[PDB]
Amino acid sequence: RHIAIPAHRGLITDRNGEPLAVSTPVTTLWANPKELMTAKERWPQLAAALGQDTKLFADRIEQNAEREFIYLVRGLTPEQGEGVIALKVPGVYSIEEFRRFYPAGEVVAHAVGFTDVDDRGREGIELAFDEWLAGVPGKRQVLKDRRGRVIKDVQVTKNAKPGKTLALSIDLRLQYLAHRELRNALLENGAKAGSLVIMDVKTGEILAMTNQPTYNPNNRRNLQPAAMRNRAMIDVFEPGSTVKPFSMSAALASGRWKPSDIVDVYPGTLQIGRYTIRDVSRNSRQLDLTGILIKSSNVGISKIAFDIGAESIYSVMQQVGLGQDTGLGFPGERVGNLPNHRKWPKAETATLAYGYGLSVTAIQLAHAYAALANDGKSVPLSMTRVDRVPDGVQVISPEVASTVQGMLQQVVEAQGGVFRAQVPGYHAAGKSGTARKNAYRSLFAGFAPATDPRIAMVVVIDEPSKAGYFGGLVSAPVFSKVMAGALRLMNVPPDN
Numbered sequence: 001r002h003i004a005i006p007a008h009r010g011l012i013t014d015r016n017g018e019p020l021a022v023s024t025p026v027t028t029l030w031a032n033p034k035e036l037m038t039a040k041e042r043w044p045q046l047a048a049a050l051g052q053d054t055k056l057f058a059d060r061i062e063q064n065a066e067r068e069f070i071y072l073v074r075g076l077t078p079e080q081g082e083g084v085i086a087l088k089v090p091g092v093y094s095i096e097e098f099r100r101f102y103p104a105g106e107v108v109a110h111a112v113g114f115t116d117v118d119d120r121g122r123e124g125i126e127l128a129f130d131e132w133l134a135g136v137p138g139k140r141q142v143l144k145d146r147r148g149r150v151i152k153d154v155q156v157t158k159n160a161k162p163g164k165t166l167a168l169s170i171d172l173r174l175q176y177l178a179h180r181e182l183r184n185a186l187l188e189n190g191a192k193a194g195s196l197v198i199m200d201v202k203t204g205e206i207l208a209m210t211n212q213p214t215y216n217p218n219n220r221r222n223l224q225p226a227a228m229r230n231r232a233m234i235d236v237f238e239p240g241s242t243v244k245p246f247s248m249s250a251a252l253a254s255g256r257w258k259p260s261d262i263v264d265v266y267p268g269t270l271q272i273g274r275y276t277i278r279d280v281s282r283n284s285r286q287l288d289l290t291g292i293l294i295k296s297s298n299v300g301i302s303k304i305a306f307d308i309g310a311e312s313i314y315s316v317m318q319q320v321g322l323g324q325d326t327g328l329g330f331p332g333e334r335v336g337n338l339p340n341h342r343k344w345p346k347a348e349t350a351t352l353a354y355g356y357g358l359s360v361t362a363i364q365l366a367h368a369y370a371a372l373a374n375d376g377k378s379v380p381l382s383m384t385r386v387d388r389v390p391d392g393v394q395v396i397s398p399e400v401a402s403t404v405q406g407m408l409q410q411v412v413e414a415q416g417g418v419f420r421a422q423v424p425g426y427h428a429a430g431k432s433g434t435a436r437k438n439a440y441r442s443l444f445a446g447f448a449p450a451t452d453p454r455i456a457m458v459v460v461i462d463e464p465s466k467a468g469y470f471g472g473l474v475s476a477p478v479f480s481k482v483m484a485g486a487l488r489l490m491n492v493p494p495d496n
């Protein structure tokens with residue numbers, strides 16, 4: 001005797017108010033079979049107007065002849081819905097429902113996400129903020145006889161309360177650029193998949209989060225599972241060489257190391273019992289601390305790790321958020337793993353230092369680079385617009401963080417460095433990685449402007465299927481292109 005009035009779901013906008021998910025009116029048709037059974041001559045026209053087969057439709061009504069309510073179709077356009085009401089079939093009733101429209105479609109599919117057949121969040125923000133966005137359904141009183149004829153909508157028991165508007169931290173302008181450049185990078189490199197995250201180092205905001213493959217959330221048929229994966233938050237991977245800046249932060253905080261110190265890495269290998277630590281380039285002897293990062297020496301970083309101890313390194317990585325809960329509350333978001341010991345064996349000490357054996361998400365890696373860029377201060381991650389910035393936690397000392405920033409600027413700008421990550425007009429800083437899963441993931445993590453950091457970025461390219469696979473070759477030019485555009489879109493003054 002009482003029906004549910006569906007509430008208008010809260011609008012999702014980007015940080016500048018551009019619409020990202022909009023509640024659109026749709027017409028749901030239901031029928032009182034007992035009443036339909038008195039107008040059988042009308043069924044074929046009704047069947048056609050609903051997009052059902054004549055006999056299948058008549059089979060469906062006959063079976064439910066005793067029932068007082070059945071749905072005919074859900075989510076017709078109010079125009080298609082009018083056409084059925086125009087038929088004037090006895091026992092046919094309509095309910096005004098809501099279906100989401102995603103104006104930017106595939107461009108921000110994984111971050112915004114989508115709703116199910118019931119207008120409930122299923123993925124991404126739609127799911128995470130489902131309670132805020134859903135509002136509360138209405139309740140009304142109706143007069144119905146024995147044949148089930150809806151005589152009159154007597155009174156409203158409770159009025160439907162709409163959902164609340166939500167402004168994301170995402171900047172659709174930076175999102176379009178990140179989407180486009182990641183898509184082009186995947187095609188050029190013949191890659192299986194990719195992720196790209198942009199963060200505001202000062203506010204903790206995620207300014208862009210894109211993955212490949214993507215999907216159109218407006219095309220509700222086919223939807224391929226693999227295409228719907230929000231890899232940036234769900235795919236865990238070994239960060240490899242991109243963790244070396246954190247091992248270096250612990251070295252500089254220990255009091256035992258300064259940038260001009262030297263480590264002898266010759267012959268480019270180091271035996272630790274059954275295990276052998278190996279460098280890619282094996283034509284070095286003495287390297288200073290910056291040289292260890294430029295050359296990306298697994299041996300160099302392992303030797304520093306043995307001197308300072310793995311506890312100091314684990315602590316920096318844990319404090320920056322590697323293998324830690326982001327607090328974003330996205331159901332199914334992976335936390336990964338950061339290994340821990342009471343007594344760190346030599347092999348585990350070395351592997352921790354060069355990012356082997358730990359598992360992280362592109363979001364955690366981006367958040368960690370944000371803390372280092374933000375002069376050692378970690379500001380809580382946010383997927384919504386931050387108007388009042390929360391207090392950050394000083395995780396790395398400002399002096400150490402500033403020293404590490406300078407070394408990462410030399411990684412990008414020095415002789416033998418990652419020249420493809422250079423951002424024309426600006427001083428950029430970062431570190432490449434290559435993680436053997438022969439199948440690899442190409443990685444680049446960095447920030448800019450090196451002199452006053454504003455944005456951190458992580459580019460992850462999964463299984464590049466061309467001549468070059470190293471992070472410095474495959475992901476570094478994507479960071480370059482996306483950073484050059486993002487800094488200019490944010491009117492960041494060039495610092496070079």
Ligand SMILES: *[C@@H](O)[C@@H](NC(=O)/C(=N\OCc1cc(=O)c(O)cn1O)c1csc(N)n1)C(C)(C)NOS(=O)(=O)O
Nearest residue numbers: 238240241280296355356432433434435436470471472
């Ligand atoms: C840093 O990312 C570092 N990478 C590694 O040491 C890893 N893999 O390497 C690639 C590799 C490994 C092999 O065993 C082999 O036979 C051939 N390869 O090409 C690594 C770390 S964690 C993980 N799962 N794999 C390095 C030295 C390559 N530097 O990265 S970059 O060159 O600065 O990008």
